[PDB]
Design a protein around this ligand. Structure first.
Ligand SMILES: [Mg+2]
Ligand SMILES: [Mg+2]
Ligand SMILES: [Mg+2]
Ligand SMILES: [Mg+2]
Ligand SMILES: [Mg+2]
Ligand SMILES: [Mg+2]
Ligand SMILES: [Mg+2]
Ligand SMILES: [Mg+2]
Ligand SMILES: [Mg+2]
Ligand SMILES: [Mg+2]
Ligand SMILES: [Mg+2]
Ligand SMILES: [Mg+2]
Ligand SMILES: [Mg+2]
Ligand SMILES: [Mg+2]
Lengths: 250, 97, 133, 87, 288, 85, 109
């Protein structure tokens, strides 16, 4: 019984959907189980490596808080009096003995307290980065669509053999639709592996997509990503945050 | 300029530990999650620096306003002196004016 | 001392009008084109040219004007998919008789942008409408 | 590995402990209760009659309105007198 | 189309090890290190400039400053109390109607314009709503029940030519914020307040039939419409016998903010319900 | 580090913990309540809103009590609520 | 659950490729053969999937995921299958590309 997936959103007349194979995780040899169509505006956009770099740097940086702090000359313990008189001593003139010139003196500039390197990229830019990551993953033959993400056994060695037989790559990232709906077999199989990482649909990002050589998507995950990413191409600006009720948005 | 005469122990750093494998996994929690949570809520750190960024004077002002009622005596004194020094330097010193 | 209140649902249909849409509605179909505002929808079949100028999210032509340094005037054609070199050739051929010389153009292939030196926004909008984009 | 459960915003109403001295006052002000009722209504557990002003609040509001909002007839009469004086 | 996708097949894997920003996107920072950027580090020789003790901006070295020798004159005097009205061209209104942002089949309100993103109102910046201008009156071919705060005489004439209804109403800042953003107000959990009357400076504007004021005498509306039609040389449409006469003649009470809703009601959007007060004092206060 | 409880609440926590908690409830609430003393050395204004003479606009206006110093010998007599300004 | 040996992914187009394509087109479409059987579109998703899967099983070579949108007609499929695919790398090619006598290369991995 072939499994066939059609695009659920209006495709522009000037672009045709891109076709992809639908594999299965049950058997080693069964690598052609179905056929799916993917929107060109998600899996076939133009590859923007600059946008990919922007999104990857943003992901690496916005969460960073550097807990580095050094005491200035005003925070070092002593140094409250002139060590010697200004004139007559014949040596250099100094004020506090905690000046940056001195041995145990404070740092001139240094790092000052916890510093937050937090900035937020525009939402359309982030969505375009996700789209470009998916597009390059599909173009470089590093994206594989499976169905229901089910496994026969909970042995991580089974996944290792399957990956090395299918030549997926050293690193595999399996994405499922929902966290609580992931089958226990694949959950236990991937709980004991380092290069095989299993994440929900909401946990997909450019950094992990680039970190892992191979991306594995289920059909519901593909539909979810398609619907979530194609919404920003024909949307108004938010009068108030979208968490608030709208006419056509949850 | 004397440099060490022995090989340092080569750090066996792995790129596939839990933190490196799940780094920033939910960075798109909002975009892919029918907005309820901003990526601000994933930032762990000081209370006065979650989802905010500023220069040293603004950071000191925000820290004093937010957690200044729980600071120690010398810490609060140092913060006040740093605020005063930064105010004077930023509003009275420099080249470009 | 809480005052008594009446719980009703009949009047709640007025609250539906007060909910703004999060998406941009598709333009209504008109019996005559162009519309009184000058808007005109794209042709049903795509042209055979080896490039496509995708419409804006508000269903407008992506031709804009840009100013730099206060005196550098430019025209930007965006959302170009296909042979942007062919689009540049067509634009320069169309604009040569108007200026008496080949217009100065810059092509951003990684982005898909044409940048002409000068304000030709309305002329290029009309040209793209006639060409069917 | 397996990813941690996603961070999800709970939809149930939240009520801070009023006996805690460390809880902020903005979470104990009546506006917080009104907003909780607006967000949830049934699950909030707030009596809907508290949203409207009480007797004393209504009296204060009416006094303020009478003092700082003249009636249309009075305002028109004042305008007429002003135009008459200017003429 | 996207030949870059086919080019990417020959290229190796795209990973974090090969990532480059756009050229010219990040100008490299320069530090006072080296022969060229050292030796006073771009500060100059002695004086106040190298030691960073320059005077303020307006200082001219002891001379009476330019920004202080000019006499004070009222230019921004009372700027924070002047009424502001965002302009809305008839051309822009026609563009919105043609693109479907606003439906002419329903009474057009400030809330509808904000939802359609045709105008942006900032009540904190002393905006008092939307005014109508005549910048596109020649090609305006729509019949709408417009509802603005100020209206130009030519814009009114243009709308009445096609057979619409122009009504100018007043909104105090609180009700204006509520109209602009009703959903945040409904999540605020407060009863709908009454609409404050215009001040004495704006009462003549809103009580005259020439401006189509919402507090004006309805008996003088046909006279003003006929005078307008005679002035601008067009026949006044038979609005009464129109199919959409109910939609054209729908009106808001001068103490009413929304359509259908009444002051004092609480809109519980979670349960999709409306709570109405029943106390005599509350009803008298809200209807007074 | 930072204190869990702000320094302002230290006195209230000390009153809540220990023998201070065994005091009668009416006494505890009588000391907890803080009524504003009647104006003595400053004249209060009536309305909460006033018209600015130079701006001709309505503005909110409030009462700021003037600090009064009560010398120790004021506790041995009845000064009527007034002291040293 | 035994692991089959991993294929070398080395594809050499056989002489009977045209006959195999014709037979598979017959077995998939099941209708009368037109005059130009190489110009039939693969628009039908079921037929395209069945044809591609049968070809992959027959020739031990499947179309890559990126080229599925390119595969539109039997002519395109024939063009795809007429080109060989080599798994050996540049070093492997240089080793077997008849190195001169004075050039010695030894693998150190
Ligand atoms: Mg010191
Ligand atoms: Mg000293
Ligand atoms: Mg000194
Ligand atoms: Mg020491
Ligand atoms: Mg030190
Ligand atoms: Mg610009
Ligand atoms: Mg410099
Ligand atoms: Mg620098
Ligand atoms: Mg130098
Ligand atoms: Mg030197
Ligand atoms: Mg000098
Ligand atoms: Mg010097
Ligand atoms: Mg002088
Ligand atoms: Mg504005």
């Amino acid at each position: 019984p072939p499994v066939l997936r059609k695009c659920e959103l209006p495709v522009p007349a000037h672009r045709r959907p891109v076709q992809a194979w639908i594999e299965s995780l049950r058997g080693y040899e069964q690598e052609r189980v179905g056929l799916t169509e993917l929107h060109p505006d998600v899996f076939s956009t133009a590859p923007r490596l600059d946008i990919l770099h922007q999104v990857a740097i943003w992901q690496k940086n916005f969460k960073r808080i550097s807990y580095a702090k050094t005491k200035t000359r005003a925070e070092v313990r002593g140094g409250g009096r002139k060590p010697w008189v200004q004139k007559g001593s014949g040596r250099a003139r100094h004020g506090s003995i905690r000046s940056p010139i001195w041995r145990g003196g404070g740092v001139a500039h240094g790092p000052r307290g916890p510093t937050s390197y937090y900035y937020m990229l525009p939402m359309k830019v982030r969505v375009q980065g996700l789209k470009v990551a998916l597009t390059v993953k599909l173009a470089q033959d590093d994206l594989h669509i499976v169905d229901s993400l089910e496994l026969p056994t909970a042995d991580p060695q089974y996944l290792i053999e399957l990956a090395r037989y299918r030549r997926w790559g050293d690193s595999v990232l399996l994405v499922d639709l929902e966290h609580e709906d992931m089958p226990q077999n694949v959950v236990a199989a991937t709980s004991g592996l380092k290069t095989f990482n299993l994440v929900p649909a909401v946990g997909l990002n450019v950094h992990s997509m680039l970190k892992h050589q191979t991306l594995v998507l289920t059909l519901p995950t593909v539909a979810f990503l398609e619907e979530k990413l194609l919404w920003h191409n024909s949307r108004y600006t938010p009068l108030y945050p979208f968490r608030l009720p709208y006419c056509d948005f949850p | 300029f004397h440099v060490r005469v022995t090989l340092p122990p080569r750090k066996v750093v792995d790129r596939w530990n839990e933190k490196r494998a799940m780094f920033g996994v939910y960075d798109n929690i909002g975009i892919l999650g029918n907005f309820e949570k901003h990526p601000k809520e994933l930032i762990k750190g000081p209370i006065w620096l979650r989802g905010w960024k500023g220069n040293e004077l603004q950071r000191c002002i925000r820290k004093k306003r937010m957690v200044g009622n729980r600071m120690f005596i010398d810490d609060l004194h140092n913060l006040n002196k740093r605020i005063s020094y930064l105010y004077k330097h930023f509003n009275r010193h420099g080249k470009y004016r | 001392e809480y005052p008594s209140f009446v719980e009703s649902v009949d009047e709640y249909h007025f609250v539906e009008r007060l909910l703004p849409p999060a998406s941009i509605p598709r333009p209504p179909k008109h019996e005559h084109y162009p519309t009184p505002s000058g808007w005109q929808p794209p042709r049903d079949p795509a042209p055979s040219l080896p490039y496509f100028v995708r419409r804006s999210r508000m269903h407008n032509i992506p031709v804009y004007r840009d100013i730099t340094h206060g005196n550098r005037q430019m025209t930007v054609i965006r959302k170009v998919e296909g042979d942007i070199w062919a689009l540049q050739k067509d634009v320069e051929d169309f604009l040569s008789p108007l200026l008496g010389k080949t217009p100065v153009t810059q092509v951003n292939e990684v982005t898909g942008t044409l940048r002409v030196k000068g304000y030709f926004d309305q002329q290029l909008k009309a040209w793209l409408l006639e060409k069917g984009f | 590995y397996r990813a941690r459960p996603p961070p999800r915003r709970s939809q149930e109403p939240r009520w801070p402990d009023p006996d805690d001295p460390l809880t902020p006052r903005w979470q104990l002000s009546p506006r917080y209760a009104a907003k909780q009722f607006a967000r949830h209504g049934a699950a909030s557990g707030v009596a809907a009659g508290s949203l409207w002003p009480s007797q004393e609040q209504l009296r204060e509001l009416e006094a303020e309105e009478r003092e700082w909002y003249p009636s249309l007839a009075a305002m028109q009469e004042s305008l007429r007198v002003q135009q008459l004086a200017e003429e | 189309g996207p030949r870059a996708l086919d080019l990417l097949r020959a290229l190796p894997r795209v990973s974090l090890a090969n990532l480059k920003p756009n050229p010219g996107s990040r100008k490299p920072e320069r530090r006072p290190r080296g022969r060229r950027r050292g030796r006073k580090c771009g500060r100059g020789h002695k004086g106040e400039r190298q030691r960073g003790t320059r005077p303020r901006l307006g200082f001219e070295g002891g001379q009476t400053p330019f920004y202080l020798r000019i006499p004070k004159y009222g230019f921004n005097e009372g700027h924070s109390f002047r009424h502001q009205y965002q302009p809305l061209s008839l051309n822009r209104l026609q563009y919105l109607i043609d693109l479907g942002r606003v439906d002419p089949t329903q009474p057009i309100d400030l809330t509808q314009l904000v939802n359609g993103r045709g105008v942006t109102i900032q009540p904190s910046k002393r905006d008092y709503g939307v005014q109508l201008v005549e910048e596109g009156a020649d090609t305006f071919k729509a019949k709408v029940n417009i509802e603005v705060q100020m209206a130009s005489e030519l814009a009114i004439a243009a709308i009445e030519k096609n057979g619409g209804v122009v009504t100018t109403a007043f909104y105090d800042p609180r009700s204006l914020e509520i109209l602009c953003k009703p959903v945040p107000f409904f999540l605020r959990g407060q009863p709908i307040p009454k609409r404050m009357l215009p001040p004495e400076a704006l009462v003549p504007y809103y009580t005259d039939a020439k401006n189509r004021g919402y507090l004006a005498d309805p008996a003088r509306f046909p006279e003003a419409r006929l005078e307008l039609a005679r002035k601008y040389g067009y026949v006044l449409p038979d609005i009464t016998k129109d199919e959409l006469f109910k939609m054209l003649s729908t009106r808001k009470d001068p103490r009413q903010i929304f359509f259908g809703l009444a002051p004092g009601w609480v809109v519980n959007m979670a349960d999709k319900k409306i709570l109405k007060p029943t106390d005599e004092n509350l009803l008298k206060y809200y209807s007074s | 580090p930072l204190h869990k409880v702000p320094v302002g609440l230290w006195k209230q926590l000390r009153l809540w913990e220990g023998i201070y908690s065994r005091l009668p409830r009416h006494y505890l609430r009588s000391l907890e309540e803080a009524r504003t003393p009647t104006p003595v050395h400053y004249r209060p204004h009536g309305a909460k809103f006033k018209i600015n003479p130079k701006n001709w606009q309505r503005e909110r206006v409030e009462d700021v009590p003037i600090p009064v110093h009560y010398p120790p010998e004021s506790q041995l007599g009845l000064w009527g609520g007034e002291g040293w300004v | 659950l035994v692991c089959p040996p991993i294929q070398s992914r080395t594809y050499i187009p056989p002489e009977d490729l045209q006959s195999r394509l014709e037979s598979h087109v017959k077995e998939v479409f099941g209708s009368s053969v037109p005059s130009n059987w190489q110009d039939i579109s693969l628009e039908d998703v079921h037929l395209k999937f069945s044809f591609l899967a049968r070809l992959a099983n027959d020739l031990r070579h499947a179309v890559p995921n990126s080229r599925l949108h390119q595969m539109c007609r039997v002519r395109d499929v024939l063009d795809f299958y007429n080109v060989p695919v080599q798994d050996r790398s540049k070093f492997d090619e240089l080793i077997a590309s008849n190195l001169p006598h004075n050039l010695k290369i030894t693998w150190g991995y």
